[PDB]
Amino acid sequence: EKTAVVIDLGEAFTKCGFAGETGPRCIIPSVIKKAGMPKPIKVVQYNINTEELYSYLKEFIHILYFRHLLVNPRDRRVVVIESVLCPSHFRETLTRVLFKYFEVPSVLLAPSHLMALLTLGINSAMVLDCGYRESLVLPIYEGIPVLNCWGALPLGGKALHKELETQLLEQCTVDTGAAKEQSLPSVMGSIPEGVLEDIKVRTCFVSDLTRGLKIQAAKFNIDGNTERPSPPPNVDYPLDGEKILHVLGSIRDSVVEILFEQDNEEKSVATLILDSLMQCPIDTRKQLAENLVIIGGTSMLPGFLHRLLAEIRYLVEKPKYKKTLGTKTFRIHTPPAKANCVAWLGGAIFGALQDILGSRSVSKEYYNQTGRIPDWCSL
Amino acid sequence: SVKIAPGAVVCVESEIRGDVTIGPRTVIHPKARIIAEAGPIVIGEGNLIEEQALIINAHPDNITPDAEDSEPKPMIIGTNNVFEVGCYSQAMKMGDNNVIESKAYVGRNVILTSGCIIGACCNLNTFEVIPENTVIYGADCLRRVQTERPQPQTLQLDFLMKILPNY
Amino acid sequence: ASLLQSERVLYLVQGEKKVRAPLSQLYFCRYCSELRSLECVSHEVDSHYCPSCLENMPSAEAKLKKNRCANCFDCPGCMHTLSTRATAYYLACGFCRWTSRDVGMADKSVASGGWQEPDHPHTQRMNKLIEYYQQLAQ
Amino acid sequence: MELGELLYNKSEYIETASGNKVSRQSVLCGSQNIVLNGKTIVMNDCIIRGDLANVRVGRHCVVKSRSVIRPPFKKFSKGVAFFPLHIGDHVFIEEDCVVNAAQIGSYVHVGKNCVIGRRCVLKDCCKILDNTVLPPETVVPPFTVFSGCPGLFSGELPECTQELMIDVTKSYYQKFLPL
Ligand SMILES: Nc1ncnc2c1ncn2[C@@H]1O[C@H](COP(=O)(O)OP(=O)(O)O)[C@@H](O)[C@H]1O
Ligand SMILES: [Zn+2]
Ligand SMILES: [Zn+2]
């Protein structure tokens, strides 16, 4: 047998490499540069025609299997990591591309949350997945994902990128280099997603709960006269060479707060753990609480894990969660690989198990016969 | 109006105009476009010029304000300075130990220091003094990086003394 | 190919999937009678090579070395093939003036042999987990 | 334009000798060391300097206007000297292009206003796109396209370059006639 390849198709970035390795070999933006198109189209797009999606995935998998990885597709197996409740037609297409065009031996559709649990070694743990599109949580108890007690909110990368763009356009101060030393607002109508992502990573950080709670009430201005903490210094960011955008200190520590803002509904990234944990079985409560896992690149943002764990323990004392989750000890697990590449590492650890892989995985001979991929929906 | 200096291997076949002031040990390559429109072109020793290099002192043609009384704006250039292929330059003051790359458009008022390099095929019209010992790379973005140590180019200049004869 | 606009007049392929492609890109199948596109045809892997130091490596050596050249290096700041410069060797880029001295990697006495990448921090924990799951899978 | 190469009428002033046509406008300072064995074209306002050179060009070589081919200086501890470059067979240097390259391979299409760096080797059957910067001491493999300010692998070329490029350079030469 040969070392099975691991792919993990995401909206922002795709993880790729081989099984039984310390981390992924290639990690790249999930896009393709088609002739005529100035900006490259995104390879994973939900709610489009199958033929157009088929062509994009055919183009992308080709780049992964030749330019990034150097190996024959037909020779060795595949371990496709994809999140639970991934759209039906997308997963059906992705398999149909691998089985028909590339003619792979067998694909294994592992849920990202159960794979993240294997990397630690613990059999039972709560898993939060703060991705690009949606920040999803799914309790895993001793190998069994509990779909009953699922939770998701659109407070990921996309929702954060959009919030940054909005704030920058309000307090817009750019030095074009054409008598634009004076503050010039909205010279460009929209900012490209590639720039916004680079600003987010380098400039913006996650504030402490004490400082963050003041920032929330400050921008609200709820019958108070200038009750904001002192912001960090303003950082100057180059746009397309000559144009120098002066990023305000307030924007850096306020953009993140949309994730941890209550917004009346009581629906934050913090609340989603406690909302799910309260809905879980009464016996499982204390085991899941003690074993928390925080995967996804959105949680890589500096000082996110401290704010989350703090915001949890504050929301615990709130009267809604005070009865059930009152006297619970919330402890976070530190996975071996980085927060972005926890999902991938599980699939590699699973891919190294050649004996179990072949049995669980769906063979091409079965797919060609039936034409029915197994899912958590009815058969 | 020419102040030719001995030791400097300025080639006669290169084009020169205006009230020029030539340096001690400068080496000008053929088809190197030097003009002294308003003020003179002051050249430091070891300031070699390679291929197309538009060095003009035409601030009266650029803006034409009819201001600053006389406004000579004398073009001062430093020592051990490499002008590469197709690089446009117009700097009233320019420091020693700096190497602009090929097809590099330098601004109308940009002051260069030591150990500083402009990116190849990169244009900078905006007026802004360059920090001490920092390099610019790429046209799409500037992406400024501070160098560890300044880079000298003496050996190259010294060898041209042997080549230029009978050419 | 590009100078003359080959991407204008296109030839059609017969089969399941119909594609409009330039004749320059397409291939004729001699075994049968039907020209087929770069898309339609199946791709294989023959040989691996480094784009800087053109050295044909075998398939077995690539798997051990993780599809990389030992001698050649690419700069991290910008994506370009580095060059060895002496004073006793330091690694430097031509496009950007990023050095190996900047990050604080010590100069090596031997040219190529000395340079190495540090071992992965969670490599020991990795093998222990594989062997546990391997026994459990068995 | 749509596969077919278009007409270009040259003026009376041009040095036509043994097939090799060289525009009189275009200076080539150092005629001794530079050599053009085949039926080469050098368009107006182009430079081929003899700064200790040995510039050998192809059978059907083409260099469009405002373009420079200068040899690079090798920074050697023994002796600093200009390395003699060798342009390959059927080489197409595009308009306003800068070339400081040592050993340019055969059957290559160098793009418009693209700066190739010092001591840069190009292997046969490659293509550099327009507005691109190849840094000093870089190599480009066959059937490749290098682009961007970094100057890195963009993709692969069509399989039939060796056969196709012959038609392009020979057609341009044949189509390029006096008025
Ligand atoms: N190392 C990092 N540091 C900070 N932010 C990151 C990092 N890596 C990714 N991100 C951000 O977090 C997001 C993570 O998305 P990712 O988990 O890769 O995608 P998906 O959820 O589709 O699998 C990216 O879109 C990016 O904005
Ligand atoms: Zn190599
Ligand atoms: Zn670099």
From Swiss-Prot, chain A:
Task: Print the keywords alphabetically.
Answer: Cytoplasm, Cytoskeleton
| Classification via SMART domains | ACTIN
* UniProt cross-references to CDD domains, sorted A to Z: ASKHA_NBD_Arp10 (cd10207)
Q: Which residues form a coiled coil?
A: none
Question: Per the UniProt record, which residue ranges are transmembrane?
Answer: none
Any one cellular-component term (Gene Ontology): dynactin complex
Which Pfam families does the entry link to? Answer: Actin
Q: Write down the InterPro entries for this protein, in alphabetical order.
A: Actin (IPR004000), ATPase_NBD (IPR043129)
- Keyword Cytoplasm (UniProt): yes
Domain of life from the UniProt record? Eukaryota
Question: Biological process GO annotation list?
Answer: retrograde axonal transport of mitochondrion
The entry's localization annotation reads: Cytoplasm, Cytoskeleton
Spell out the subunit comment: Subunit of dynactin, a multiprotein complex part of a tripartite complex with dynein and a adapter, such as BICDL1, BICD2 or HOOK3. The dynactin complex is built around ACTR1A/ACTB filament and consists of an actin-related filament composed of a shoulder domain, a pointed end and a barbed end. Its length is defined by its flexible shoulder domain. The soulder is composed of 2 DCTN1 subunits, 4 DCTN2 and 2 DCTN3. The 4 DCNT2 (via N-terminus) bind the ACTR1A filament and act as molecular rulers to determine the length. The pointed end is important for binding dynein-dynactin cargo adapters.
Q: Give the function comment from the record.
A: Part of the dynactin complex that activates the molecular motor dynein for ultra-processive transport along microtubules.
Q: Which family does it belong to?
A: Belongs to the actin family.
Protein name (record): Actin-related protein 10
UniProtKB/Swiss-Prot annotation, chain B:
Superkingdom, taxonomy of origin = Eukaryota
**Which keywords appear in this protein's UniProt record, sorted alphabetically?**
Centromere, Chromosome, Cytoplasm, Cytoskeleton, Kinetochore, Phosphoprotein
Q: Which GO terms describe its cellular component?
A: centrosome; cytoplasm; dynactin complex; kinetochore
Q: Which gene encodes it?
A: DCTN6
Q: Tell me the protein family, please.
A: Belongs to the dynactin subunits 5/6 family. Dynactin subunit 6 subfamily.
Can you supply a Gene Ontology BP term from the record? mitotic spindle organization
Q: How does it assemble?
A: Subunit of dynactin, a multiprotein complex part of a tripartite complex with dynein and a adapter, such as BICDL1, BICD2 or HOOK3. The dynactin complex is built around ACTR1A/ACTB filament and consists of an actin-related filament composed of a shoulder domain, a pointed end and a barbed end. Its length is defined by its flexible shoulder domain. The soulder is composed of 2 DCTN1 subunits, 4 DCTN2 and 2 DCTN3. The 4 DCNT2 (via N-terminus) bind the ACTR1A filament and act as molecular rulers to determine the length. The pointed end is important for binding dynein-dynactin cargo adapters.
| Compartments reported by the entry | Cytoplasm, Cytoskeleton; Chromosome, Centromere, Kinetochore
Annotated protein name in UniProt: Dynactin subunit 6
Query: A Gene Ontology molecular-function term?
Result: dynein complex binding
- What's this protein's function? Part of the dynactin complex that activates the molecular motor dynein for ultra-processive transport along microtubules.
UniProtKB/Swiss-Prot annotation, chain C:
As for subcellular location, the record says: Cytoplasm, Cytoskeleton; Cytoplasm, Cytoskeleton, Microtubule organizing center, Centrosome; Cytoplasm, Cytoskeleton, Stress fiber; Cytoplasm, Cell cortex
Give all N-acetylalanine modified positions.
Answer: 1
User: What cystine pairs are annotated?
Assistant: none
Ranges that cross the membrane: none
- Domain of life (superkingdom): Eukaryota
Q: Give the function comment from the record.
A: Part of the dynactin complex that activates the molecular motor dynein for ultra-processive transport along microtubules. Together with dynein is involved in spindle assembly and cytokinesis.
Q: Which family does it belong to?
A: Belongs to the dynactin subunit 4 family.
According to the record's subunit comment, the protein's assembly and interactions are: Subunit of dynactin, a multiprotein complex part of a tripartite complex with dynein and a adapter, such as BICDL1, BICD2 or HOOK3. The dynactin complex is built around ACTR1A/ACTB filament and consists of an actin-related filament composed of a shoulder domain, a pointed end and a barbed end. Its length is defined by its flexible shoulder domain. The soulder is composed of 2 DCTN1 subunits, 4 DCTN2 and 2 DCTN3. The 4 DCNT2 (via N-terminus) bind the ACTR1A filament and act as molecular rulers to determine the length. The pointed end is important for binding dynein-dynactin cargo adapters.
In Swiss-Prot or TrEMBL terms, this protein is called Dynactin subunit 4
Q: Which organism is it from?
A: Sus scrofa
Q: Which gene encodes it?
A: DCTN4
Curated annotation (Swiss-Prot), chain D:
Q: Which residues carry this modification: N-acetylmethionine?
A: 1
* Family as reported in the entry's similarity comment: Belongs to the dynactin subunits 5/6 family. Dynactin subunit 5 subfamily.
Spell out the subcellular localization from the entry. Cytoplasm, Cytoskeleton; Chromosome, Centromere, Kinetochore
Entry's Gene Ontology BP terms: aorta development; coronary vasculature development; ventricular septum development
Q: What is its main location?
A: cytoplasm
UniProt xrefs under InterPro entries: DCTN5, Trimer_LpxA-like_sf
Key words of the record: Acetylation, Centromere, Chromosome, Cytoplasm, Cytoskeleton, Kinetochore
Q: Which Gene3D superfamilies match?
A: Hexapeptide repeat proteins (2.160.10.10)
Return the protein name. Answer: Dynactin subunit 5
Q: Which organism is this entry from?
A: Sus scrofa
GO terms under cellular component:
centrosome; cytoplasm; dynactin complex; kinetochore; nuclear membrane; nucleoplasm
Biological role = Part of the dynactin complex that activates the molecular motor dynein for ultra-processive transport along microtubules.
Pfam families documented for this protein: DCTN5
On assembly, the entry states:
Subunit of dynactin, a multiprotein complex part of a tripartite complex with dynein and a adapter, such as BICDL1, BICD2 or HOOK3. The dynactin complex is built around ACTR1A/ACTB filament and consists of an actin-related filament composed of a shoulder domain, a pointed end and a barbed end. Its length is defined by its flexible shoulder domain. The soulder is composed of 2 DCTN1 subunits, 4 DCTN2 and 2 DCTN3. The 4 DCNT2 (via N-terminus) bind the ACTR1A filament and act as molecular rulers to determine the length. The pointed end is important for binding dynein-dynactin cargo adapters.
